[model samples]
Target chain A: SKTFIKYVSGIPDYFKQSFPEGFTWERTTTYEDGGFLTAHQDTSLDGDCLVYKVKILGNNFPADGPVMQNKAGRWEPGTEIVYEVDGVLRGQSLMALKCPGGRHLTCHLHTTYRSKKPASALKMPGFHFEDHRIEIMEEVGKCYKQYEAAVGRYCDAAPSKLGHN
Target chain B: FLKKTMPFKTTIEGTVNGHYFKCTGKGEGNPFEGTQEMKIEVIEGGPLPFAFHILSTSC
Candidate 1:
């Protein structure tokens, strides 16, 4: 729970201000041996944009580092290269990246397999996977912009209810 | 000297059966209204396997 609290607290203030009013937080647990909540968008009754998820590492779990799916549906261990813009509630935007024979995305985290590989072994210490990180951040920003625009358009089209009173 | 060895012959038969269902419509409701079954038999001896009879069905 400490990581969850820390992650929630570390979110940029500007990012928090983008949500609509009456936003709240909730959590759910998935129980199974090696149980994993597969790649998915956070959709709840509270609102799509209002929902967020923080994954807490369980006991003896190796750090997989953050991963994203590319357009070709590969589960690479790196940040996403494209933005997720299909605003349908509960849509499989991220799942589309896991298509057959898709590219793999991964974070620049040290692991035995990657450490042994020549491509990763040659990199200096602390040389994080900057390109993928920036790509993922940009994709998130694009989604946020689309959501904000949608909210604005929906609000603007509202009819005045003053006469109904 | 002891007795000499001799060759022997044997016959083997194998039968296989299977069934499957399929849908035939595209627009709306369930279109699977039928079923199909098939059977086949084979006999083999010597050093290789060979088919003797084959059957198929569709609906």
Candidate 2:
């Protein structure tokens, strides 16, 4: 699988402005054939852990853009290939998450484009567009402990090189 | 527990001298907190239409 990772300083910065206090945003995306992308925001408020997680899987169909769809508890995981020129493919997928008791309502949107035949291509189509929402819910005190632990382990798996340290 | 920011498994896969190849590098110790090494293996692609360095690093 071909993997490329990106980091956003301002994405979290904006989240910090909106929340004022308590919100750690981890914005990272990985693109490959049959790959998956995720975004997590850990909101700590009043001694409770409120986490928002988004997972999107790539497919060979048309990509999903920011078109307002019907309101639902969960958005179906789906993707469509938007375009492909000289084996450089572009696509997007929809992601949604509903926390327990609706304490937080946040939706992260991402559109991706990458290479199917990277080595044979003349140009590399590497681009990602991201947007998310932040809203509060009435419920609190409970948390998604297991998913938060998994996210921590995943973040620890960042890239490393040979020899040095 | 091992130290944070330890190097885990790293991979480099792409064009090598206009040929397709894949490389896997593993770090020392079960916690991946030591020296690392990589092995590049060429796949079955004779030549691509592009030219790129086999392996390049930055400071």
Candidate 3:
């Protein structure tokens, strides 16, 4: 992987999921006009976090558009390398974080695709789709407050000092 | 969340255990302008009807 973002250890258990069945979630976005993924950051929590692995595949994308590498420390645009692959774009898996409520959790993988078509379509064949704002969910004590603090200290730490500091 | 919303279309088909669903919604607050076709799966258990919000937020 590129050396822009430093790998950090002791990720809070709040960001991890422990289940005996081993949960998996997959989403494949197909663009009509074709496009590229932005902020393609390969997070260090691939196998160690709540979400075990994330796989992304594209059908009508170029050789370099499907999967990208984030050499920058942040999820900003214009700092990624296009990897060439076949119909299925392969790369490091994206993971998810456990949320406050035991009922649901949220994951963030900056796989935002830029397209040109007006009408978009989605096909979800899964167990559940809890479509609600995070604020509406019940919080366990001051979870968000502590989580934001952790983000500043760990998730949003300086690139070079994150792993060590 | 779905109360105050944008213009879109949604449909559901199949049984309670497994099913196939689709949604054709115009881009509301996304950073781009274009249509997206998303195919999502569970792979672990059987399939069920699902629709999730793609809003960007910190949890």
The number of the candidate with the highest TM-score is 3
lDDT tens digits by residue: candidate 1, B6-46: 11111112111111111111011110111111111112221
Error in Å for residue B26 of model 3: 0.6
Could you arrange the candidates by DockQ from highest to lowest?
A: 3, 2, 1
lDDT score for candidate 3 against the true structure: 0.20
Can you tell me the CAPRI class of model 1?
incorrect
Candidate scoring better on DockQ of 2 and 3: 3
lDDT tens digits by residue: candidate 2, B1-59: 22322223323344322334443332221112212222222232323222111021100
Clash pairs (backbone) in predicted model 3: A17-A50, A117-B34, A117-B35
Instruction: Please give the range of 10 consecutive residues that has the lowest summed lDDT in model 1 chain B.
Output: B50-59
Candidate 3 per-residue C-alpha lDDT over A115-158 given as tens digits, one digit per residue, 9 for 90 to 100: 11211221111111111112212112111111000110232334
Clashes in model 2: which pairs? A61-A80, A61-A81, A62-A80, A62-A81, A63-A80, A103-A137
- Give candidate 1's fnat, 2 decimals: 0.00
True contacts kept of each: 0.00, 0.00, 0.00
What level of docking quality does candidate 3 show?
Answer: incorrect
lDDT winner between candidates 2 and 3: 2
Residue A116 CA displacement from its true place in model 2, Å: 8.7
What are the Cα lDDT values of the candidates?
0.17, 0.25, 0.20
DockQ of every candidate: 0.01, 0.02, 0.02
